[PDB]
Design a protein around this nucleic acid. Structure first.
Lengths: 385, 25, 100, 26, 358
RNA sequence: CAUUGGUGAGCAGCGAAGGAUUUGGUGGAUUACUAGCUAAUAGCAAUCUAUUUCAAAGAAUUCAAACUUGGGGGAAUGCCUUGUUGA
């Protein structure tokens, strides 16, 4: 416990009169240290479509996918850029599967698996739609939910299809994989998120999450609380460990396009022109219920921790850097990294992921993970069963 | 100023050394 | 010091929280109706928040030979060549000559 | 010296609201 | 005089005339309102696309232009237009037969001066309301108080205080009351141009001599002076972007850029606008941006920028000179010969005594 | 000899305080101009926060839901379907 060398950043009001959420990002960029203040990027690439964002599980490479033709893998911290592909088919998402050397893009029809340089490795005959393209490196399993009812699991270690699960739910409106559990979460128009394992052809458990369609879903690091948003201007705080929505934030001004969860407990809600993050909102009490406005400054009622409004955009998606305190918000013209104080964890474990990794360390670690892949039957509702 | 015949450069089966059939020479 | 004293400014009172923008001016959540001098002090500090004071206004003021003597006569010149001379000598290397 | 014009976007700033200056009657 | 077959549509080909244009903001972005005789024009600043024109030709030529956020205030002969989107929403006809010289907007008030050395005050009917329609009063400037009214400005953080500057001196009023709260002493030169400041309390004045005076009111003192050899100043502006910079616009067409911290001129632009048509008529830095919009009497409206400074180590010392940006021009002289160029009535050639085609 | 090849010298010839070339950057147009942002009848634009939350309104194929598959074989092991068996 005392070996833990680095401690989180904080944000403190210092008055009741002074307010926490009112800080702006140019105002933040004054006091943050120079490399960390400079780690906020403004990539306005206004020519192509709205931009999809994903950092790798280590923050070392950023992958972006504009809706029209852009596919871009930068070695994000440095000036290096690996991939810049212009496919005139339209794309939806992308993820690095194992390392920055191999990634996968979610196109109009077919998923593509791709080299760092931008070369074509593997076009999938299957995956005939691809809306959410997500990965779990602990099974080496690219799990993809298109606009189809089905859900496809490709084991890119072997390079073969594991399984394909028809939901009977229709087009997938959301998918968030569980880091702690590797159960997949699919969200559809009935207000229903289904938990999934590749073995079980019926879902593990269905959840009538909200009314209307599922806008998005996002899961804790601990796998305890998953924050779900419907298109009904509502966001539920599901505690998966006992399958209860802790708080039901009703009547947003606009339904959130996405939700995202940091490591230390931050929650990101992006209505699209606005991005708003709460601190410690996932806890058990309804005092920790995330609320927009606490009248009278009552400590029980909970205000948002950090706010932002995008002027000329309706942003697409967002994702924290997993070890740093920023979050990449993909807007129509591009990418902002909005600086949080305490979102990411300060003390990573190198033996799990390496944010500072040599290429020789990388090819050691890749072989280490491929030795430690699990075959797909081990995806279960509990890791420990 | 883009060159003509902008083609999809993809995996060469006869040139990529990552292939173990071209791991020999 | 103030050179004019608006006696009639203090006996004003502004209810402040009717405006949506001046809610940065309230120095507590309690006060809502404030006399003239307190509000104008808050408003001056708000204009400080908008633009910080540059160095020339606060400090730089004009109110044997002095060493500023070259700088001033440079500053009141833009053309340093004596083109207003009509020197009645000819400058070298450059002919003001027009073909007719 | 590389004397080249750069692309200059308008960034946002803030100015004083002159419409906030009046107090009404006593 | 009325035609039956044809009717006036607009006078195509005009950008400005020389009447001092006004700047306004929508949110983060800027618009520009210029005059063309009896018809005013609105522009985006970021492209100089034309935004609005007047709904009507005014019966006499517009003398003054001010602009708040959504409401542009034109001022022709005796009456003052409150325009939203170039449409006459409220005409405010002043209770003289004197001609409207200058104008300003602050608070719940409007203040507009006439050439009878008397300013009219127009309250809003409520602070809840947005445009000023209630007539408050008329205050005047008698010849023991000041000279001919050169400008009305409102320097910020001055509660109902109206700053009326003349060729002689500066006055301050409580426009709720109507009382002269302060009179400044005469400056010995003929004051020709006013401008407020992003610092407190300071009004910049460019006189008939080449002299700019920064002037306090809490001091009542002329804190600094700035000389110009043999040029008559027309416009003053302040770059509020992040380095303290001052814009001096002559009526000789020249634009002079100062850094008051280094006490030095930065670059003087020559001949960005024609001297015979008024010189530089009005130049103004867009607030909090390194972009200055200049306007001449040659039917031209230019933009210039400071490039960000090349000196990484210094910054503020090494300054790139201002650089040409987008501009909408017109024929400076009236057009001698025109024709319809294309078949689909898209383009018209217009040649003038300005010695150019357009 | 045609060089109708250019180099190379030159000259006639053109010819106002240079001529000729090559390129970087940026701006302007490249569709016909009604302002920016937001939760939008309004507020903002120095700010939406210590009215943004109560309120209402808000849940069918009783599980319709790959309109999407290179073509042949097969399809062990899976699944599907009914036949059939137990709880």
């Amino acid at each position: 416990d005392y070996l833990l060398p680095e401690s989180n950043g904080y944000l403190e009001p210092e008055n009741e009169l002074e307010k926490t959420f009112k800080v702006q990002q140019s105002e933040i960029k004054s006091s943050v240290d120079v490399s960390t203040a400079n780690k906020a990027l403004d990539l306005s690439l206004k020519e192509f479509g709205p931009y999809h964002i994903k950092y790798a599980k280590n923050g070392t490479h950023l992958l972006i996918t504009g809706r029209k033709g852009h596919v871009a893998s930068m070695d994000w911290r440095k000036g290096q850029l690996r991939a810049e592909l212009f496919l005139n088919e339209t794309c939806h998402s992308a993820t690095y599967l194992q390392n920055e050397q191999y990634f996968a893009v979610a196109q109009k029809k077919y998923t593509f698996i791709y080299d760092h340089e931008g070369t074509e490795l593997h076009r999938l005959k299957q995956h005939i739609e691809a809306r959410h393209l997500d990965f779990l490196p602990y099974h080496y399993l690219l799990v993809t939910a298109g606009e189809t009812g089905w859900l496809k699991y490709h084991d890119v270690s072997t390079g073969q299809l594991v399984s394909e699960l028809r939901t009977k739910a229709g087009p997938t409106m959301a998918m968030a994989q569980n880091p702690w559990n590797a159960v997949m979460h699919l969200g559809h128009s009935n207000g229903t998120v289904s938990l999934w394992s590749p073995s079980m052809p019926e879902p593990l458990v269905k959840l009538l999450s909200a009314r209307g369609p599922v806008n998005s879903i996002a899961i804790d690091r601990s796998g305890y609380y998953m924050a779900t948003t419907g298109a009904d201007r509502s966001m539920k705080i599901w505690d998966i460990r006992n399958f209860k929505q802790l708080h039901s934030v009703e009547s947003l001004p606009t339904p959130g396009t996405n939700v995202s969860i940091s490591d230390t407990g931050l929650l990101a809600l992006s209505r699209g022109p606005h991005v708003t993050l709460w601190k410690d909102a996932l806890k058990l009490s309804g005092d920790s219920k995330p609320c927009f406005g606490s009248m009278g400054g009552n400590p029980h009622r909970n205000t948002p921790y950090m706010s932002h409004l995008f002027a000329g955009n309706k942003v697409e998606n967002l994702g924290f850097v997993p070890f740093e305190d920023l979050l990449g918000v993909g807007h129509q013209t591009g990418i902002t990294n909005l600086i949080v104080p305490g979102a990411g964890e300060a003390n990573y474990d190198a033996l799990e992921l390496n944010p500072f990794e040599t290429k020789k360390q990388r090819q050691e670690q890749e072989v280490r993970t491929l030795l430690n892949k699990l075959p797909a039957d081990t995806i279960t509702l509990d890791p420990n069963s | 100023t883009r060159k003509f015949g902008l083609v999809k450069r993809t995996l060469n089966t006869k040139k990529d050394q990552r292939l173990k059939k071209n791991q020999e020479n | 010091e103030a050179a004019w004293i608006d006696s009639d400014d203090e006996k004003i009172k502004v209810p402040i929280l009717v405006t949506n923008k001046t809610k940065k001016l309230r120095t507590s959540y309690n006060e809502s109706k404030i006399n003239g001098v307190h509000y104008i002090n808050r408003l001056r500090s708000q204009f400080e928040k908008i633009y910080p004071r540059p160095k020339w206004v606060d400090d730089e003021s004009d109110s044997n030979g002095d060493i500023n003597a070259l700088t001033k006569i440079l500053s009141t010149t833009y053309n340093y060549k004596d083109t207003l001379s009509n020197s009645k000598l000819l400058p070298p290397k450059k002919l003001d000559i027009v073909r007719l | 010296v590389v004397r080249e014009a750069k692309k200059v976007e308008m960034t946002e700033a803030r100015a004083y609201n002159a419409d906030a200056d009046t107090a009404k009657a006593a | 005089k009325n035609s039956k077959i044809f009717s006036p549509f607009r006078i195509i080909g005009n950008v400005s005339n020389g009447v001092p244009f006004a700047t306004g903001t929508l949110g983060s972005t800027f618009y520009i309102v210029t005059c063309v005789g009896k018809t005013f024009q609105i522009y985006d600043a970021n492209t100089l696309h034309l935004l609005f024109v007047s709904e009507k030709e005014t019966p006499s030529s517009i003398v003054a232009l001010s602009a708040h956020f959504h409401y542009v205030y034109a001022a022709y002969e005796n009456k003052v237009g409150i325009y939203k989107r170039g449409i006459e929403e409220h005409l405010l006809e002043l209770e003289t037969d004197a001609n409207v010289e200058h104008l300003c907007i602050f608070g719940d008030y409007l203040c507009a001066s006439t050439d009878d050395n008397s300013i009219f005050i127009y309250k809003k009917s409520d602070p809840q309301d947005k445009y000023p329609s209630e007539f408050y009063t008329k205050l005047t400037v008698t010849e023991i108080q000041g000279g001919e009214i050169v400008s009305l400005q409102h320097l910020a953080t001055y509660l109902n205080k109206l700053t009326v500057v003349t060729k002689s001196n500066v006055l301050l009023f409580n426009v709720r009351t109507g009382k002269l709260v302060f009179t400044s002493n005469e400056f010995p030169d003929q004051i020709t141009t006013a401008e407020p400041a992003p610092v407190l309390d300071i009004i910049a004045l460019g006189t008939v001599t080449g002299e700019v005076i920064m002037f306090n009111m809490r001091k009542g003192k002329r804190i600094r002076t700035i000389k110009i050899p043999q040029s008559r100043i027309s416009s003053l502006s302040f770059r509020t972007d992040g380095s303290s910079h001052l814009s001096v616009g002559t009526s000789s067409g020249d634009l002079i850029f100062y850094d008051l911290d280094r006490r030095s001129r930065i670059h003087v632009l020559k001949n960005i606008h024609r001297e015979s048509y008024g010189g530089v008529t009005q130049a103004t830095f867009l607030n909090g941006q390194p972009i200055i919009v200049t306007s001449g009497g040659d039917n031209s409206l230019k933009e210039y920028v400071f490039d960000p400074s090349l000196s990484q180590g210094s910054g503020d010392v090494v300054v790139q000179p201002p650089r040409y940006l987008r501009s909408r021009g017109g024929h400076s002289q009236p057009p001698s010969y025109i024709a319809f160029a294309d078949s689909q009535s898209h383009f018209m050639l217009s040649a003038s005594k300005d010695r150019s085609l357009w």
